[PDB]
Enzyme design. Structure first.
Site, PDB file in Angstrom:
ATOM      1  N   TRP A 282       0.493  -1.541  -0.372  1.00 16.19           N
ATOM      2  CA  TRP A 282      -0.049   0.348  -0.402  1.00 16.19           C
ATOM      3  C   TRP A 282       0.919   0.764   0.087  1.00 16.19           C
ATOM      4  O   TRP A 282       1.945   0.483   0.012  1.00 16.19           O
ATOM      5  CB  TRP A 282      -1.277   0.136   1.371  1.00 16.19           C
ATOM      6  CG  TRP A 282      -0.076   0.154   2.670  1.00 16.19           C
ATOM      7  CD1 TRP A 282      -0.015   1.510   2.978  1.00 16.19           C
ATOM      8  CD2 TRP A 282       0.778  -0.601   3.458  1.00 16.19           C
ATOM      9  NE1 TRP A 282       0.808   1.340   4.015  1.00 16.19           N
ATOM     10  CE2 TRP A 282       0.812  -0.190   4.419  1.00 16.19           C
ATOM     11  CE3 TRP A 282       0.587  -2.257   2.858  1.00 16.19           C
ATOM     12  CZ2 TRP A 282       1.843  -0.781   4.855  1.00 16.19           C
ATOM     13  CZ3 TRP A 282       1.629  -3.044   3.946  1.00 16.19           C
ATOM     14  CH2 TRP A 282       2.177  -2.336   5.167  1.00 16.19           C
TER      15      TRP A 282
ATOM     16  N   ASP B  14       2.135  -8.660  -3.859  1.00 16.06           N
ATOM     17  CA  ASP B  14       1.072  -7.200  -4.904  1.00 16.06           C
ATOM     18  C   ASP B  14       1.632  -5.850  -4.682  1.00 16.06           C
ATOM     19  O   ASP B  14       1.263  -5.499  -3.823  1.00 16.06           O
ATOM     20  CB  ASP B  14       0.089  -7.914  -4.149  1.00 16.06           C
ATOM     21  CG  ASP B  14      -0.684  -7.920  -5.099  1.00 16.06           C
ATOM     22  OD1 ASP B  14      -1.374  -8.260  -5.898  1.00 16.06           O
ATOM     23  OD2 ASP B  14      -1.887  -6.195  -4.741  1.00 16.06           O
TER      24      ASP B  14
ATOM     25  N   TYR C 189       0.005   2.866  -5.842  1.00 18.72           N
ATOM     26  CA  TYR C 189       0.701   3.557  -4.411  1.00 18.72           C
ATOM     27  C   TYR C 189       2.186   4.377  -4.723  1.00 18.72           C
ATOM     28  O   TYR C 189       2.352   4.829  -3.829  1.00 18.72           O
ATOM     29  CB  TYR C 189       1.032   1.322  -3.556  1.00 18.72           C
ATOM     30  CG  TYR C 189      -0.394   1.593  -3.646  1.00 18.72           C
ATOM     31  CD1 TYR C 189      -1.635   1.843  -3.729  1.00 18.72           C
ATOM     32  CD2 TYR C 189      -0.082   0.446  -3.611  1.00 18.72           C
ATOM     33  CE1 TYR C 189      -2.482   0.954  -3.332  1.00 18.72           C
ATOM     34  CE2 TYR C 189      -0.898  -0.873  -3.876  1.00 18.72           C
ATOM     35  CZ  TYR C 189      -2.209  -0.475  -3.353  1.00 18.72           C
ATOM     36  OH  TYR C 189      -4.114  -1.064  -3.382  1.00 18.72           O
TER      37      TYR C 189
ATOM     38  N   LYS D 235      -0.139  -3.851 -11.615  1.00 23.95           N
ATOM     39  CA  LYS D 235      -1.800  -3.308 -11.862  1.00 23.95           C
ATOM     40  C   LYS D 235      -1.765  -1.954 -12.416  1.00 23.95           C
ATOM     41  O   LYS D 235      -0.819  -1.100 -12.744  1.00 23.95           O
ATOM     42  CB  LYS D 235      -2.404  -3.079  -9.995  1.00 23.95           C
ATOM     43  CG  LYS D 235      -2.866  -4.550  -9.393  1.00 23.95           C
ATOM     44  CD  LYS D 235      -3.953  -4.176  -8.719  1.00 23.95           C
ATOM     45  CE  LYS D 235      -3.438  -5.186  -7.459  1.00 23.95           C
ATOM     46  NZ  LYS D 235      -2.282  -4.640  -6.678  1.00 23.95           N
TER      47      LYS D 235
ATOM     48  N   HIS E 193      -7.136  -2.799 -12.805  1.00 23.40           N
ATOM     49  CA  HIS E 193      -6.607  -2.600 -10.904  1.00 23.40           C
ATOM     50  C   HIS E 193      -8.759  -2.496 -10.794  1.00 23.40           C
ATOM     51  O   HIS E 193      -8.598  -2.704  -9.999  1.00 23.40           O
ATOM     52  CB  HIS E 193      -6.191  -0.736 -10.392  1.00 23.40           C
ATOM     53  CG  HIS E 193      -6.185  -1.042  -9.186  1.00 23.40           C
ATOM     54  ND1 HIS E 193      -4.786  -0.573  -8.858  1.00 23.40           N
ATOM     55  CD2 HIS E 193      -6.772  -1.535  -7.798  1.00 23.40           C
ATOM     56  CE1 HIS E 193      -4.430  -0.635  -7.324  1.00 23.40           C
ATOM     57  NE2 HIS E 193      -5.786  -1.305  -7.078  1.00 23.40           N
TER      58      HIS E 193
ATOM     59  N   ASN F 259     -11.583  -6.108  -8.502  1.00 24.23           N
ATOM     60  CA  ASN F 259     -12.915  -5.290  -8.469  1.00 24.23           C
ATOM     61  C   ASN F 259     -13.845  -5.359  -9.627  1.00 24.23           C
ATOM     62  O   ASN F 259     -14.470  -4.665  -9.845  1.00 24.23           O
ATOM     63  CB  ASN F 259     -12.466  -3.884  -8.451  1.00 24.23           C
ATOM     64  CG  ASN F 259     -11.668  -3.472  -6.946  1.00 24.23           C
ATOM     65  OD1 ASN F 259     -11.827  -3.925  -6.024  1.00 24.23           O
ATOM     66  ND2 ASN F 259     -10.356  -2.799  -6.776  1.00 24.23           N
TER      67      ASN F 259
ATOM     68  N   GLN G  13      -8.771 -10.218  -8.353  1.00 20.54           N
ATOM     69  CA  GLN G  13      -8.157 -10.232  -7.291  1.00 20.54           C
ATOM     70  C   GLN G  13      -9.334  -8.513  -6.584  1.00 20.54           C
ATOM     71  O   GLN G  13      -9.718  -7.724  -6.662  1.00 20.54           O
ATOM     72  CB  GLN G  13      -7.507  -9.588  -7.148  1.00 20.54           C
ATOM     73  CG  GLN G  13      -6.100  -8.835  -5.232  1.00 20.54           C
ATOM     74  CD  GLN G  13      -5.041  -8.405  -5.908  1.00 20.54           C
ATOM     75  OE1 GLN G  13      -5.118  -6.448  -5.049  1.00 20.54           O
ATOM     76  NE2 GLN G  13      -4.226  -8.252  -6.422  1.00 20.54           N
TER      77      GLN G  13
ATOM     78  N   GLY H  17      -9.742  -8.388   6.814  1.00 19.70           N
ATOM     79  CA  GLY H  17     -11.019  -6.931   6.858  1.00 19.70           C
ATOM     80  C   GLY H  17     -10.153  -6.057   7.425  1.00 19.70           C
ATOM     81  O   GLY H  17      -9.149  -5.609   6.992  1.00 19.70           O
TER      82      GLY H  17
ATOM     83  N   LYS I 148      -1.235  -7.078   4.629  1.00 14.06           N
ATOM     84  CA  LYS I 148      -0.646  -5.902   4.511  1.00 14.06           C
ATOM     85  C   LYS I 148       0.056  -6.020   5.558  1.00 14.06           C
ATOM     86  O   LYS I 148      -1.163  -6.375   7.284  1.00 14.06           O
ATOM     87  CB  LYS I 148      -0.971  -4.988   4.378  1.00 14.06           C
ATOM     88  CG  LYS I 148      -2.923  -3.909   4.421  1.00 14.06           C
ATOM     89  CD  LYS I 148      -2.961  -3.743   3.324  1.00 14.06           C
ATOM     90  CE  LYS I 148      -4.747  -3.268   3.519  1.00 14.06           C
ATOM     91  NZ  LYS I 148      -5.970  -4.749   3.425  1.00 14.06           N
TER      92      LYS I 148
ATOM     93  N   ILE J  67       4.045 -10.855   9.767  1.00 13.13           N
ATOM     94  CA  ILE J  67       5.001 -11.256   8.565  1.00 13.13           C
ATOM     95  C   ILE J  67       5.295 -12.857   8.871  1.00 13.13           C
ATOM     96  O   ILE J  67       4.628 -13.564   8.052  1.00 13.13           O
ATOM     97  CB  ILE J  67       5.921 -10.636   7.620  1.00 13.13           C
ATOM     98  CG1 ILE J  67       5.947  -8.476   7.446  1.00 13.13           C
ATOM     99  CG2 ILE J  67       6.633 -10.714   6.850  1.00 13.13           C
ATOM    100  CD1 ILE J  67       6.089  -8.147   7.273  1.00 13.13           C
TER     101      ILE J  67
END
Ligand SMILES: [Co+2]
Lengths: 301, 306
Positions: free
Chosen positions: A20, A43, A48, A77, A110, A154, A175, A205, A243, A250
């Protein structure tokens, strides 16, 4: 269990590091830490801005011999302003240049949404999407060897099917947001019917890890709630993109392979109330092709 | 060439005019097949449900024996009827068609309807079986892999149903054969087929006289202005839209007139007037709309294309 097989034949590692937009160094350090810990899937997204920083971390891992290029699965993306067919390969070449790679393992549209090249998300910049035309350019990128696989992000069941119907090269991946609070059952079944792989973004989430069903299963199995949420997705056949920038988490997020959620506990996930967390407000607008959230997600809400 | 053929997504050429066959009394269809090919037709469209494939096979044998044409010059289609949708039954049905036609392969094999009944039974509620089109299609794909059907496709599939099949298929349907004529112009499906590379074959291209398409004032007026018959105008319209046509004419003179649809055209202004013809679907599929069918309404069968 550790990989899923794409419709190209290629293997996608079932856990990848979600990235991100962060402060300088934060994502580069996470990528290095994750691959050292055993991650083989990173990813990325051009929007970003941090592909150069990620590319330096990959270069560091390669030079230290932690991994070789062919050991890693690297995704990026195509952002919404590069949908024009002539702009697609140029955007891919910019991502490749910044990542210092010769090819991507996966390149995704994306969003099913378009703005004028070089402009931000604002209604004067909205251009009606032409996904078949953009996809034709993605296919040329795939044919040229620059993207080993191409897919989308999406996309509803309906929009994925509309693309499958016209495509020569099938999207390998859709994705999407997917986690115990938003289980995507309709899209999951549709992906199984068509051979498209579902990669779960936002797999943690953060109220989802507070669900009593997850906390209870975590206690019973001696795992963290995050490990239970990730394992749920993997048992459904989805790769996951947690993430995190904390080395300990991790490494925990990787320990989702050699244990399983038993059928009795798996059944309880139907008791978790469902809500889509990333609703896409930024492209729902009176001047957008999506005037309602239902139009963007085609009822999947 | 000038639309004398269209190219399927397999790369094979389909002749843009073919003889549409139907269920008649003994001898009729065989004579028409012989007469049509002698006059220049290179495309014969069959269906097992009509029970006349043996008779058609005898006419083709006669054509080959006399040297009128060789097998490689003809495009031969047949169709899988609703009672043979079970995957075990699909290749057996194709082999029966091939046996009766006395052919080693079909150029095209179509699912006749998105609908299924028990093997050997008629269309009555007690005989309905929920369709599994992807599974039936998988068996069609095996026939294609084996070379017994050089192309496979569907018939009477709405844009939605064609799209649903395209999204799961390994081998894309090459053709969607549907009712299409000036009284039922199929613009939505026509656009969808163009978008997906599926070829549209028009059955009942004259509106099934045996109707009133040929008596539409727009058609009569265009025919007078172009120096052609109303039937030629109707057929030329479909060909100019990029569709093959399957007229059912048995009369030798009308058969030959049906081939004169290439060296002239409908001008852009007269083409625009086709928009004025009232639209009505003639083959409505009543036999498979039923409280016990997967299609409770005609709108469900045709997915709004009504
Ligand atoms: Co396909």
């Amino acid at each position: 269990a550790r990989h899923f097989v794409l419709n190209t034949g290629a293997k996608i590692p079932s856990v990848g590091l979600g990235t991100w937009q962060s402060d300088p160094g934060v994502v580069g350090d996470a990528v290095y830490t994750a691959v050292k810990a055993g991650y083989r899937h990173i990813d990325c997204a051009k929007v970003y801005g941090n592909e150069k920083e990620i590319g330096l971390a990959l270069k560091k891992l390669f030079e230290e011999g932690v991994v070789k290029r062919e050991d890693l699965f690297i995704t990026s993306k195509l952002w919404n302003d590069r949908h024009a067919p002539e702009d697609v390969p140029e955007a891919l070449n910019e991502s490749l240049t910044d990542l210092q790679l010769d090819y991507l393992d996966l390149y995704l549209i994306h969003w099913p949404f378009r703005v004028k090249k070089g402009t931000n998300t604002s209604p004067e910049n909205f251009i009606t999407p032409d996904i078949p035309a953009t996809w034709g350019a993605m296919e040329k990128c795939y044919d040229a060897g620059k993207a080993r696989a191409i897919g989308v992000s999406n996309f509803s069941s309906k929009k994925l099917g509309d693309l499958l119907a016209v495509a020569r090269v099938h999207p390998a991946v859709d994705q999407v947001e997917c986690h115990p609070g938003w289980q995507q059952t309709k899209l999951h079944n549709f992906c199984q019917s068509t051979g498209v792989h579902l990669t779960a973004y936002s797999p943690l989430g953060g109220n989802v890890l507070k669900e009593p069903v997850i906390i209870s299963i975590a206690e019973k199995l001696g795992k963290t709630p995050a490990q239970v949420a990730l394992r749920w997705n993997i048992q459904m056949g989805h790769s996951v993109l947690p993430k995190s920038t904390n080395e300990e988490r991790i490494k925990q997020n990787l320990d989702v392979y050699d244990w399983s959620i038993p059928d009795d506990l798996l059944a309880k996930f139907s008791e978790i109330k469902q809500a889509r967390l990333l609703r896409g407000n930024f492209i729902v607008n009176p001047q957008s092709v999506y005037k309602t959230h239902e139009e963007l997600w085609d009822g999947e809400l």
